[PDB]
Amino acid sequence: EKVQAMYIWIDGTGEGLRCKTRTLDSEPKCVEELPEWNFDGSSTLQSEGSNSDMYLVPAAMFRDPFRKDPNKLVLCEVFKYNRRPAETNLRHTCKRIMDMVSNQHPWFGMEQEYTLMGTDGHPFGWPSNGFPGPQGPYYCGVGADRAYGRDIVEAHYRACLYAGVKIAGTNAEVMPAQWEFQIGPCEGISMGDHLWVARFILHRVCEDFGVIATFDPKPIPGNWNGAGCHTNFSTKAMREENGLKYIEEAIEKLSKRHQYHIRAYDPKGGLDNARRLINDFSAGVANRSASIRIPRTVGQEKKGYFEDRRPSANCDPFSVTEALIRTCLLNETGDEPFQY
Amino acid sequence: GEKVQAMYIWIDGTGEGLRCKTRTLDSEPKCVEELPEWNFDGSSTLQSEGSNSDMYLVPAAMFRDPFRKDPNKLVLCEVFKYNRRPAETNLRHTCKRIMDMVSNQHPWFGMEQEYTLMGTDGHPFGWPSNGFPGPQGPYYCGVGADRAYGRDIVEAHYRACLYAGVKIAGTNAEVMPAQWEFQIGPCEGISMGDHLWVARFILHRVCEDFGVIATFDPKPIPGNWNGAGCHTNFSTKAMREENGLKYIEEAIEKLSKRHQYHIRAYDPKGGLDNARRLTNDFSAGVANRSASIRIPRTVGQEKKGYFEDRRPSANCDPFSVTEALIRTCLLNETGDEPFQYK
Amino acid sequence: KVQAMYIWIDGTGEGLRCKTRTLDSEPKCVEELPEWNFDGSSTLQSEGSNSDMYLVPAAMFRDPFRKDPNKLVLCEVFKYNRRPAETNLRHTCKRIMDMVSNQHPWFGMEQEYTLMGTDGHPFGWPSNGFPGPQGPYYCGVGADRAYGRDIVEAHYRACLYAGVKIAGTNAEVMPAQWEFQIGPCEGISMGDHLWVARFILHRVCEDFGVIATFDPKPIPGNWNGAGCHTNFSTKAMREENGLKYIEEAIEKLSKRHQYHIRAYDPKGGLDNASASIRIPRTVGQEDRRPSANCDPFSVTEALIRTCLLNETGDEP
Amino acid sequence: EKVQAMYIWIDGTGEGLRCKTRTLDSEPKCVEELPEWNFDGSSTLQSDMYLVPAAMFRDPFRKDPNKLVLCEVFKYNRRPAETNLRHTCKRIMDMVSNQHPWFGMEQEYTLMGTDGHPFGWPSNGFPGPQGPYYCGVGADRAYGRDIVEAHYRACLYAGVKIAGTNAEVMPAQWEFQIGPCEGISMGDHLWVARFILHRVCEDFGVIATFDPKPIPGNWNGAGCHTNFSTKAMREENGLKYIEEAIEKLSKRHQYHIRAYDPKGGLDNARRLTGINDFSAGVANRSASIRIPRTVGQEKKGYFEDRRPSANCDPFSVTEALIRTCLLNETGDEPF
Amino acid sequence: KVQAMYIWIDGTGEGLRCKTRTLDSEPKCVEELPEWNFDGSSTLQSEGSNSDMYLVPAAMFRDPFRKDPNKLVLCEVFKYNRRPAETNLRHTCKRIMDMVSNQHPWFGMEQEYTLMGTDGHPFGWPSNGFPGPQGPYYCGVGADRAYGRDIVEAHYRACLYAGVKIAGTNAEVMPAQWEFQIGPCEGISMGDHLWVARFILHRVCEDFGVIATFDPKPIPGNWNGAGCHTNFSTKAMREENGLKYIEEAIEKLSKRHQYHIRAYDPKGGLDNARRLTNINDFSAGVANRSASIRIPRTVGQEKKGYFEDRRPSANCDPFSVTEALIRTCLLNETGDEPFQY
Predict the structure, then answer these.
(1) Degrees (nearest 5) of the Cα angle D79, D84, D90?
(2) Residue E246 and residue D280: Cα distance in Å, rounded?
(3) Enclosing H/E stretch for A9
């Protein structure tokens, strides 16, 4: 009969997620049937005045993999009391920018790295007040002393498939208890939609096991490699045969806009990303140390995608996909986006 | 085999506590009127201090039992004395007659019940031993193990109310860690108090299975930590129809003349419990998060809908809250004692 | 036969290392102690094979952990070429302190520290949590307000037994944070005193399985930081009708504000992030910037230069 | 050679204690030798503030020659602080010095764990009903005797005129009596006796609370009964003079209550169940004022005051006893 | 200045109470000790309307916990009217002792007790279950034989330091049960030395976080109960051929079994009933451990000495035990109640 719907949105910090549930009379068939909702903005660092209430509008709807069918999750945009977008609602203008290049059909793919941490502040499975063995045997590893907390990974992978998230796989990363899941390919605004819901699903999955998933770019200092969010990018021109010419062109316009993307690759403006790496743009084919990498299968087939390895794990996908479209496809120049 | 478990629930002499016990029935009852009358020991519930201990239980509202599944039933009951008169804490008997008087106006109620999850040690659930968690901010509607404490209880109670037939509108993590909230409504008339009381029972009965305590104390932890209240929505047919805002403002004006009457009827102690939460002065406003009466911004632009009272506190009797709203706003009662009709 | 634990500073400029040798006689004064050596490779003050560094005893104190015959000696650190190392600040500060020996400069510090357990959280703090908001913890008494008092009492007793001129202790505003006052002491003597007091505090924290840190902001947020305020006084400042001479020094300090931060912590000002410099209300009737991991040599040396030699510029 | 001196003072709450230590160069022979000091006022709910030494004892934790010092607190203007209630009490004591008044108070307190529950109490529960715990002996009868015994021998070494100890009706509740002390020396003796207790409990990891009703219910409350005499009632047929001073105190029942806890009676309101009513009777503990049967038969001795709370301030309790009984003051205001 | 710990018996007739007061100088004897008072309503001895009760020093020993020159004081309890308390049995017993002082009554008692943890189970016992069957525990040695010897050893030297005339110890048949002997004491000092011995025992166990119980049957079943056997002799019985008067006194005890049973535990029965099975049967014999009265074999062969009463409970009051023995054997009293003089 009735249906549960968990509204999900981004709070005032640009990283955290907030959620709450409401009961519906009937099961919605599409995102447009869901009603609007509201919440207190003073409690999520989004307002601080007499008119402190904010508004929620559904943007993307997925199946709830925890309450199962016919329950739904829904990612929402945040609007202020004047019906204007909030300071952390980067999806509004990002969608408008995507609607400007609909003809080019841009496709995205981002590799979200994350680290499982216990409630004691330390990485999950790590020795208490200590370190495990040196890096090496954990990347894609198997066994009790190689992969830490695969149960969380498997549950998060089933949940994303059930919910409808376009997740292309998982893998264990070099640092122990650090994992990675790739989503894509997603067209246009649907990219940040899928990742943010995938990020929410991860946290809610970790809550069942009593662990914390951190998207910090460098959670453990030293010679423990940090967590990034490498972004694959391609449009219809780059995907058609001998489209590498437009690839090489797009990367050339990224050389003139290094600091601008760094300003849009974390919510702190490069302060968090400085921990991971940073001031030398480097582009090469299949080079892991390069800023921008073109893999082999696209290099020798002269068509495909190119990978941006700069954005950190705690980045907003809406801002990094916007920053890519304005520079590559909208040919924008200057430190500030045009207003149109 | 063909027998059915019926679980009679009632309110004790404290006005806040719930009691319960089960009996076996020959067949599944098709409606609340098919349930037999029962009795209990009043001397064990702060109700019969005299020579006659026996107290009668009359079924009022029947739900599906969400713990032992169908065909077993939950049963909310009214309490009566040995002389067949209502008990001091039975506030549903008079409230139902008042809701029957105004059935044409179709009074719709909604209530936001806030509560805090406690451990058996006396500290909030998931809180550090002999300490405090981080400052307020990241816990309101939060997600993650370090943000929401005890979502297992919330999901179970929300799935259990839906199974029982309790009209529950949704839940949200409140601003204090381990403090949560569920909405009940919209409910017409007496079924409001019927649905909130049973939802309170299901919440306590679910926390029992998790080994934790649910408290409706208006201020369980002192300081800058937020209190617990049961905000109440009120709408009638005239106030929901087109250009119903004029009737909404009319009822609010009548509420401003009976502030002390409603405060005394908004907690079982008579106002002393809400004094710890409220930091006596009637205020009104549109979308005012700090007023006694709040009119939602959407019903202001639409000029129709409901309004919502933010005085009733969390340990309140919903039958006392709803009856006061009808007596003041609909029946235009005055003074400081309910009118005795007919 | 007697024991003497030599004490010096490593390449970090923040931590100390120590080791002992057995001597056949009790050294009556610091000048009767033989020089020693160690491996510079394991202390981040050298590279390869030319890493053999020397130890020059500088200031001697009574050992409080061992018997009275045994003693502790702070030392200066010299490289293979027989010139001061990067983390050695005694040589250049002693020379600078010697140049104004006649004015009798007297210094006194209030070193602030925070007790922390092995897990990485403050000592006695709720596991994965915080105590009450700070307020009742300043100079508090009671197990729920004063954390690890047995540490500060043993350190207070050990320093007095050692001969350290320690003027007092008190509990700071945040729990598990204390401070001890070192002073007044004249020039170089001050710098040696605080360093061995830091060793005494670290060494006594070993006995209780806890850790003292001199991080200026150990716990981020509303909780207070750790500063090592320094009192500066000369014979002209101590003499009557000399309050105006103090103001002239303050004016000399002004515009050298940028220079102070660059040498008021080992990182170079990066870690360091009422008024900024205060004059007591009583002395009117008649420096709060040094942070907590500061090298007392850098604070003394730079302060003496700027306020006495009237020096100016970026480099000395 | 050098010595350690602990400076103790009262904070902005008017019931909490604070302390800091400073090194001296010689063992001071008396209290007036100790130099003055300062401290931060913004961290103590009071604001620089002035500490003046005016009461000296031997440190029982740092044995001789180390000392501790109870101080008075003042503002930057050298005027008395809002929580410094002794300067006015020292003046009142000096005025009736010719009368020579003796005080004696029974300070009750409760031992608490770091978990908020009373020391030795069952986890998430209660021990047996009251009865066997008052002055009891046994591991199941007296909880925390080590703390009591240490504090008792620490007050002796320090110099506090401590008369004894006992176990109270509620488990983990204890009592120590200070007296007889003449005049001002009363408030100086208990406040440092409270500091020794908090400092002893610190070594055991337990908490000492002066809350007048820490555990609600049928469990007994914690007070600070006050015994009082000046030269007239200790003298021949002093009973008549003692009797007279109780209706003087009966006329100002409400005034004393407001000066018998730092919250103005709200803290003591939870304990005084039986309330707002005055009572008097010989050897009657259910009354507000009780004269012993020993003084009743001997017709000379002391009167007991059972109103003040455990967290009261002795300077406020003693000063009020003098304005009313000896100075015969009246009205809701002080002079 | 000197601490003095006043000790008295409360309204239950079994439990002891105590509190410490400060004295300006060490008193040389008991008579130099000032009187004191306490709340009788908190010890189930008064109503509270007129509650003050009196404490008078009766016996004084050295405090073995807080060492010399501090002291422990055993005190009699008196009412508002300076009258003997219902649980004050020393006043009548002492004056009865004085009536027969020229016969010199000597007393010795074997106080048995069982050590208990704060969990209601015997000390060192294996959680929910029993240890091995008795046999190797009586006077045993080893970790699996004697439970809690630390307490017994600490209690022995504490009694010797105080002055309590303790005669020895022995581990008893039940593990965690022990026994100490007090005597020989003349007249009223028996109850004075046993009561202080009990206080030292409770105070010693307090340091070890354990409980000493004097219940006559702490653990039900075939496990041995706790008694307080009493040896009794007058100088006429200790003189040559003094057995004559022993058989004479035992024969007077044969006629007053119910009176003595009622005075041998604070409830006048219902306590010793759980231990004796016999409470209603009286018997005597030589070296007979199953009889109510036992005459040792040495005193049977030498025809001079004492005899042993095995009836008194472990929680008995020594004053009522010794007073009953004198009223029957020496004063030749009769009736269900004692005489007045």
Answers:
(1) 90
(2) 60
(3) strand A3-10
Q: Is E186 annotated as a binding residue?
A: no
Alpha-carbon gap, residue D180 to D302, rounded angstroms: 10
Number of A/B CB contacts below 8 angstroms equals: 75
Q: Cβ contact (<8 Å) for D131 and E202?
A: no
Burial of E333: CB neighbours in 10 Å, binned 0-12, 13-18, 19+ = middle
Cβ neighbours of residue C11 closer than 8 Å, sequence gap 6 or more? C43, C44, C45, C86, C87
Residue A313, burial from CB neighbour count under 10 angstroms (0-12, 13-18, 19+):
buried
Q: At what angle do helices A190-209 and A91-100 cross, to 10 degrees?
A: 140
Euclidean distance between CA atoms C43 and E221, whole angstroms: 72
Residue bearing tokens 């009788």: E40
Phi, psi of E38 (to 5 degrees): -155, 175
Is there a cis peptide before residue C184, judged by omega within 30 degrees of 0?
yes
Chain B residue numbers with beta carbons less than 8 Å from the beta carbon of A23 are 162, 168-170
The experimental method, as deposited, was X-ray
DSSP letter, residue B103:
G
* Residue A9, amino acid: W
Q: Which residues of C touch A122 (CB under 8 A)?
A: 120
Structure tokens at C154: 């043993």
Task: Note the Cα D37 to chain centre separation in Å.
Answer: 25
Query: DSSP of B120-171, one letter per residue?
Result: TTSSBTTPPTTSB-SPSSS-TTB-STTT-S-HHHHHHHHHHHHHHT--EEEE
Q: How far apart are CA C263 and CA C293, in angstroms?
A: 11
Residues of B within 8 A of A52 (CB-CB) are 289
Q: Report helix angle B191-210 to B151-164, nearest 10.
A: 140
Peptide bond into A28 cis (omega under 30): no
Residues of A in contact with C128 (CB under 8 A): 119-121
From the list D116, D123, D124, the residue facing B130 with the nearest CB is: D116
Q: How far is C177 from chain D (nearest CA, A)?
A: 13
User: Which residue out of C119, C121, C130 would a mutagenesis test of the B interface target, given it has the greatest number of B Cβ atoms within 10 Å?
Assistant: C130
Identify the chains in contact with C, defined as 3+ C-beta pairs within 8 A.
Answer: A, B, D
Phi, psi angles (nearest 5°) of residue D106: -105, 95
- The annotation status of E313 as a binding-site residue, yes or no, is no
Identify whether the C-beta of residue A165 lies closer than 8 Å to the C-beta of residue A67.
Answer: no
Report the chain C residue with the minimal C-alpha distance to residue D3. Answer: C160
Q: 3-class secondary structure for E71-124?
A: EEEEEEEECCCCCECCCCCHHHHHHHHHHCHHHCCEEEEEEEEEEECCCCCECC
What amino acid occupies position C281? R
Comparing alpha-carbon positions, the chain C residue that sits nearest to D40 is: C138
* Sequence letter at residue D50: Y
Q: Binding site, residues of C?
A: 110, 112, 172, 179-184, 222-223, 229, 231-233, 278, 288
Q: In angstroms, rounded to a whole number, what is the distance separating the alpha carbons of residues A183 and D158?
A: 73
Instruction: Please give the order of strands across the beta sheet that includes B18-25.
Output: B18-25, B4-11, B73-80, B54-64, B38-41
HEC assignment per residue over chain C: CEEEEEEEECCCCCCEEEEEEEECCCCCCHHHCCCEEEECHHHCCCCCCCCEEEEEEEEEEECCCCCCCCEEEEEEEECCCCCECCCCCHHHHHHHHHCCHHHCCEEEEEEEEEEECCCCCECCCCCCCECCCCCCCCCECCCCCCCCHHHHHHHHHHHHHHCCCEEEEEECCCCCEEEEEEEEEECHHHHHHHHHHHHHHHHHHHHCCCEEECCCCCCCCCCCCCCCEEEEECHHHHCCCCHHHHHHHHHHHCCCHHHHHHCCCCCCCCCCCCCCCCCCHHHHHCCCCCCCCCCHHHHHHHHHHHHHHCCCCCCC
Per-domain boundaries in chain C: 1-86, 87-316
